[PDB]
Amino acid sequence: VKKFPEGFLWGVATASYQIEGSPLADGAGMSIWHTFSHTPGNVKNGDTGDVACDHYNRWKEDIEIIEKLGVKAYRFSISWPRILPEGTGRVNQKGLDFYNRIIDTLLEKGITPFVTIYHWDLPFALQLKGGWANREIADWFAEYSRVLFENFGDRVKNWITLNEPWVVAIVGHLYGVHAPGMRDIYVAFRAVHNLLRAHARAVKVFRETVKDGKIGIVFNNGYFEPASERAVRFMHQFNNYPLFLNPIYRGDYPELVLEFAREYLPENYKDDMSEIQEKIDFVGLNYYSGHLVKFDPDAKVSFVERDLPKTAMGWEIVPEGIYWILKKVKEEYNPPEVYITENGAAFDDVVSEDGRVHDQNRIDYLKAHIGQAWKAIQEGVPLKGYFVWSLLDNFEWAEGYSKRFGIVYVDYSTQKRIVKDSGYWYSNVVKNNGLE
């Protein structure tokens, strides 16, 4: 068998825009995902978060699903514009009350809430003032974070400032594939820098307001490998946790990031670094794929396709990556606690005639990664928890509804939920506190 440590947090994870729907209910402000997805051409099939999983109405049943599966932790995010419809200033009690009911219900059911403060749905009102490009966002974010800590910090004790700030900066502001949909390298690196400043201000305010809780930050990571016998050292440093953890722990950007990007960063960016070093309580690492990488003169890096099995996203399934990245983070920065805050896969799920969803492919994926996580714990990585992405099939950003990541199938025509075989399988893992 593979038993995990006593008290290991087995979890599932969601994000507000991907599941909630009703983006403008109860006096909520527009988010940048509302405006981006309503812009023709930005999202597959013109899909939006208008309805999604209708979790804004079905939240109680969904938590009853988490309970019934015996899952011990739930990572969810708060929609900033439901809380402060203009981004700053006015606080919306109906928005607070939506999340209050969720927190109380989870607590009554003995499920530990992990709250993501920012999972990509910036208030549109702040994007009009440049969003992550504007240095003043460190102030706006701190004021928002402060509201959350004052309102929920008596019950919620585990907080995440930012979800995947590499994605927010680069996919949102360089690639233009995510909200706000821009393609300017200078803006993208100023967003990187402001994301760190905003993260650090929120942690500062947390220490002053929630003296008994823990706060951290979540990064996306690939497992990168060379096509021959350095483009790999760059990909690690740029795409993975070092872009942010080098500032947080060491007070500067990693070496190859500066070679590539010094021109695009603010001129006096080091002036901010002392504040960016604000102590964090844990690191969340997300992981789903590995990549073969080569220097290509035509960022000076391209990917090489490998004949390996791939998910419906076309992402190569490389389970040892989750082990590598956990080892590497202890090796590089030795954070006191690590959580895998996101791991999962998209497959072309169908409901069989028997009424079930036979996603053996997703069981194989989860088992292989959970096994590697186990390994890292055996070799002394202080992994305290593991979150499957996702509880529910949901709005997959620019792919819309065409990609299903849930351990629970959602029939969008009816909003029926059908626990997939992977959901039943994972529930058994949780009950036994590991594999066999």
UniProtKB/Swiss-Prot annotation:
Which gene specifies this protein's sequence?
A: bglA
Q: Which UniProt keywords apply?
A: Carbohydrate metabolism, Cellulose degradation, Glycosidase, Hydrolase, Polysaccharide degradation
- Keyword NAD applies: no
UniProt similarity note:
Belongs to the glycosyl hydrolase 1 family.
Q: Which SUPFAM superfamilies match?
A: (Trans)glycosidases (SSF51445)
Catalysed conversion reaction: Hydrolysis of terminal, non-reducing beta-D-glucosyl residues with release of beta-D-glucose
Query: Catalytic residues?
Result: E164, E342
Q: What top-level branch of life does the organism fall under?
A: Bacteria
List the molecular function annotations (GO) for this entry.
Answer: beta-glucosidase activity
This protein is called: Beta-glucosidase A
One biological process term in Gene Ontology: cellulose catabolic process
Q: What EC number(s) has UniProt assigned to this enzyme?
A: 3.2.1.21
Q: In which pathway does it act?
A: Glycan metabolism; cellulose degradation
The protein's matches in InterPro entries, at most eight in alphabetical order, are given as: Glyco_hydro_1, Glyco_hydro_1_AS, Glyco_hydro_1_beta-glucosidase, Glyco_hydro_1_N_CS, Glycoside_hydrolase_SF
Matching Gene3D superfamilies: Glycosidases
